[PDB]
Design a protein around this nucleic acid. Sequence first.
DNA 1: TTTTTTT
Lengths: 536, 639, 124, 138
Amino acid sequence: LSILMLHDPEARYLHKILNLLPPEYYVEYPLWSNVVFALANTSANYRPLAEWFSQKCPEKWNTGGKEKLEKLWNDASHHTEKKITKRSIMYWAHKHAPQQYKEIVEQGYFSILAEYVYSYNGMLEHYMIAKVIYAMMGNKFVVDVDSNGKYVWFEFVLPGQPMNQGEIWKWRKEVNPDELHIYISENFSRVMDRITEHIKYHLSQPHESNILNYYKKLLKAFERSKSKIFNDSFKKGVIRQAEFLFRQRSFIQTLDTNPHLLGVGNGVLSIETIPAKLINHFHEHPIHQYTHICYVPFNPENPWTKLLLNALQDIIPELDARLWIMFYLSTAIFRGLKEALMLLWLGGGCNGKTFLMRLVAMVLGDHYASKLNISLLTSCRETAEKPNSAFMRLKGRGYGYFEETNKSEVLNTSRLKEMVNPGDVTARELNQKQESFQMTATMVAASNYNFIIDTTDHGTWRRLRHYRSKVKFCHNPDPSNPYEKKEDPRFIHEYIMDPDCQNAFFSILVYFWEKLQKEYNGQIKKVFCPTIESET
Amino acid sequence: RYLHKILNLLPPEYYVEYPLWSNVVFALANTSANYRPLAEWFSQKCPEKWNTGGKEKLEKLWNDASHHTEKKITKRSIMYWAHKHAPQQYKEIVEQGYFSILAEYVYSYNGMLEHYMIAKVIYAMMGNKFVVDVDSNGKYVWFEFVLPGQPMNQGEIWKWRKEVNPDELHIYISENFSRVMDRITEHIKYHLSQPHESNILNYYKKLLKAFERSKSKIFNDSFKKGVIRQAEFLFRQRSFIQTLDTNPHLLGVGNGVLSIETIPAKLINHFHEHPIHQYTHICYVPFNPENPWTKLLLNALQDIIPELDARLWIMFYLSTAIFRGLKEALMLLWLGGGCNGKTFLMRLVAMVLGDHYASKLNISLLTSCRETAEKPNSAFMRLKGRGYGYFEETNKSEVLNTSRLKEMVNPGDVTARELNQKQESFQMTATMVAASNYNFIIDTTDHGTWRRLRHYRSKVKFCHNPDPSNPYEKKEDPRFIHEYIMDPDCQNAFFSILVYFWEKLQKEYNGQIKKVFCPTIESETEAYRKSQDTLHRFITERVVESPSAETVYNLSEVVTAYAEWYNTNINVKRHIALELSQELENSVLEKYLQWSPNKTRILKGCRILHKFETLQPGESYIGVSCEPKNKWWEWSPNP
Amino acid sequence: GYFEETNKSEVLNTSRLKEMVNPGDQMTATMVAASNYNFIIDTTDHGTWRRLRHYRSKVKFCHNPDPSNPYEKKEDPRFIHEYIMDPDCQNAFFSILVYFWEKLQKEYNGQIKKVFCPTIESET
Amino acid sequence: LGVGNGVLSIETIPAKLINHFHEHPIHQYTHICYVPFNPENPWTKLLLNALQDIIPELDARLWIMFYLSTAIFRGLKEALMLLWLGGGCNGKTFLMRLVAMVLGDHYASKLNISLLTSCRETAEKPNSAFMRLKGRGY
DNA sequence: TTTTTTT
Ligand SMILES: Nc1ncnc2c1ncn2[C@@H]1O[C@H](COP(=O)(O)OP(=O)(O)NP(=O)(O)O)[C@@H](O)[C@H]1O
Ligand SMILES: Nc1ncnc2c1ncn2[C@@H]1O[C@H](COP(=O)(O)OP(=O)(O)NP(=O)(O)O)[C@@H](O)[C@H]1O
Ligand SMILES: Nc1ncnc2c1ncn2[C@@H]1O[C@H](COP(=O)(O)OP(=O)(O)NP(=O)(O)O)[C@@H](O)[C@H]1O
């Protein structure tokens, strides 16, 4: 719901005061409505009644009594003879607990800035306004140091924002805090103006003995320092000093490490419990990478879902083989340690390869899936200090597919054991240090003739699976042959590029993952398919 | 004088106990490199037993302490002891100590403050928590000692962490330092409140105006950058990065520093002066067999290795992976058909040791590829400061070279570079374990090579579905690799097991794995060395004692026959005619090998088969043709 | 400079023997190469063979059985393990090296070809 | 030619030693100082006797000395190459090294026989040693 | 640190 909106820190400021109010307003009608009326007089933008619902009980005084208070708020928002100021709310907060009121208000943004202004005679520096900016904007930005030793910014993206598609409810990477710079020359300028008005009020007080000359000196110095907010070097120094306040020590190493959370085009998909849920609100899970596909729950009545299921029935005629292949491809959405399995798909001519495997790759995106070259499997390995950037193309992804065969390639079994087992793999990123990571990828290879397995040990044959396509796609020359069917080029030209088709296929994959988690205990060896076993 | 006050807050008990007295004496010797504050501390603690006499004996004891204990105790230990014994008194004195320095600078420079002044004050009040040193690239690097209440990464407690920038020190300047700066302002106001006299308040007014002008520089970014740049010369310790992780008896762990200097191993979870930077994520708990994870792991260890003596040997061998010092030149080959839990053990040891202390080494470094040592070669930098290396790759029955097996096994010195690094030299300190699926073929018969090689055969299979009544085949577990090796509690239990076995090795024997008696291992190694002698097999197979035979066999004929025999029976490979001649010369052939009138080695009679069968019937051929009772972890200390 | 690592009976090029022994362009290193099997010298040049000296050791250090042959003795491994890393042993050996340098400078005029040793000449 | 005591000018006979201010741009040099030829110098007499010993016949000695004297000139010269052959301990490897040493690193260089014997390649490969005789006369 | 060029 975002009861304390990150774009408005005055909501948090007022929620602290509403917590500070006595608990006599809790579970009662009359004075609760009086404070609601006063708060709507001060600011009628659905914020303070939401803070009332958050801090205190929303409707414990009367269940279903929300609409009466909404109508009272509407009557307050319309022209109202009485107009209660916020000073009544400060008076009630001071009446309930003076020391707690004082302790609450020292941590506010305005009090920090005013304390700096009064204690340093209107001279404002980088750390002071960096501290105020962190106080009022600290939940939306974060800083961390990467492997190269540079401070990197991250911003949480909210629905109303000039946002790149699919970035909502996630942390996006920033080389510079673009939003913070504008905020300093805009939102911060507004609060600076409030401090100017406060100084003018204290100037309007009587002269007393000598305080009025000090007040005019303070006003002159603060008016001199107020222009520094729009200066480029000052803003750069403020942002440089703010990197030590916005710093979170273990943010980058935690950034994409939960394999049960998947960034999607409308939020974060959580597959921790069945059924999978869509987090499209504020949360504390660090999520940076995503896929462009939006998650809609699986519904077979969707025309795209129906078309895709009919296509799946077309590609694999055997029911058990179709169920096994769907269960295997559903595990591509998981980026954790999975079972040591590998599927080899063999097809003669125009078959379902490059439509199905490419569909899985396009619904998972570049961060979660990749296309790999067959030189990683067939050619002999390179000396490990050479920076193999193709081997780094499966670091944090749960899906990989090979697609090229020259003429009955012979695959290196050492690379097969290295890239399939649930262990650690060491490799060097280009122009970077040699490092070890974890194998979390579901791997599929499509061939045209065959693969030669030189060895006959139990190690390479307990992790190898084989399937041969029984359907030939020849539209023009489609005979009575049952395994022969007429093709549509749209499946390779338009349907694989269509976002609705991709959304439907992603829903199918999530449904099959949940089916595997429900019927079995997520273990794919228990999937009893005689066709795949006999072909192997 | 400040340190004299710190010594004055020390209790009289520090002269009651002799070792604590000597520790403080050595600490003061590291402070002053003389005996003047040492003599002041002698007079403060005890002016009355030895009195003036024995002062030369006190200098002798100072010289003896300065050449002892190998660990530099310095100011920070005394400051910590003063905090522990007199915390409130410790809070004061220092509170005014830097306040006075700052006051001296303010009064002697008329309130105009610069980078070096506040850098000196900041060093006076944070010198025990930060350090600066120059690395190999010529850059000044900061290190911060991590305290328990801190925004701290996991496992970093009670250690030195590397900081690109002293972020904490920057905040300290705009926060803690600003507070002491205020105290100065309150002091100036007191002087101004004091009567003007002649123009003293005029001075206070001028000094005040200048100080309030310069007080706002503490929050300026360029000023703080200049202060931090000036503090790099004050926080600098000249031998820090070189000494950073060099004690092999100290190991960084997730709850502090584990010390295996003295049995039993101790967890330092308080202040210390040991330089420790690297660590493992595993927290150390003392060994307890009643723990369910520990009991499960010990059951797996008993089930994997059925004989007790070999189980004790491999456990004593793998316990030495926690030591990063000089160990015996050893290499263990574990051979099995991929159906045993040998592979479960190596990944477990690597995971409880971490990436700083263990690494995975490909078999390419032993089989074919040569060491460059002129390119970057980041792969050979993966055993620089680690105590464990395991080979977990076998393509198809790899043949390992003798040169690499003599290069990286013996405790010598090796030289390599890395990215942005020069050709630096380091020491081999890693316990090495190689997994074999098919076979390892030792092409030599060298006495020095075979003294460092150990072999043990896997005897237990594991299968998923069928699980027959075979005594040597049991059922596998889906979790043992997928869940039980990711679990932190299982890793903690296994690390406790490793520390217990290291302590057992140090107790029953003098840390030498040669003195450990395992007759099974000796019998297997002798059998493997007999099976790896291809020359003996060739002589037994193709050379038969032909009585009254006039067949003339010069070494060249034997060399050619053996070369065909080796290439045909063993892997095809090139041979040295001369070296082969010497090899066949040193064998039973000597009995039937004699010089010729032309001085040429010849084999009298002894017709060679030259083919299958075709052997001489006459004169036959030439080639001669416990139990664990209750707990297995502990055993006979003196079998 | 020293060569120690012998895999299997290394043959050695006469070119590099000519290049890296001669005082060409600057070589200032005393060079020792050790082997366990053989060095294959493929030449018969007089200029190459005069810069080569050969010595064959006559002592084998036996640990376990220790027979009573005068040319084999009982050894301790500490000489490789502990005694080479001790700073006091290193100081003593450096003192020995300096003493023998002074002895060479005194008894001869710093020329090692003037040192008379029939064993080395006979073995070479 | 830059020399250790100034500039040697061989534009006219006799060669002159510029040891004062001049407008000739000269950066590289050799460490050898130039003294005029004097056969009564003991080192010069020793070297002339060594040259008489190494090459016995007079005409070949004069020819080889004339050919080696053109190493101090850094311009276009005749297309010639001398092949000096011998059995054993000869005067070779001392005379050629002497010419290289008196000319220095800028004005002379040592080339390996791999430049001549074999392994001419496609010029994608750099061959790593052909600019070792960029601007030197020997 | 790569390109290279190791070959
Ligand atoms: N279920 C389907 N129904 C109808 N047409 C299909 C179906 N699946 C694929 N096609 C078409 O079949 C054609 C073959 O393309 P493609 O799938 O790339 O062949 P391929 O076997 O994967 N690769 P290749 O064998 O080298 O040509 C494409 O034009 C697709 O549009
Ligand atoms: N002590 C044990 N008792 C029973 N099963 C075990 C034990 N240790 C390991 N296993 C099982 O045996 C297998 C060992 O893991 P694995 O990664 O296959 O190494 P591996 O035996 O060498 N197989 P491979 O790498 O192909 O040679 C897993 O399935 C474990 O569940
Ligand atoms: N003029 C000379 N008078 C006497 N000795 C000389 C003279 N010139 C050279 N030598 C010596 O003769 C030896 C020949 O060595 P060197 O100058 O290398 O000729 P070389 O042909 O290269 N010998 P080699 O390397 O076997 O082919 C050296 O010891 C020289 O010092």
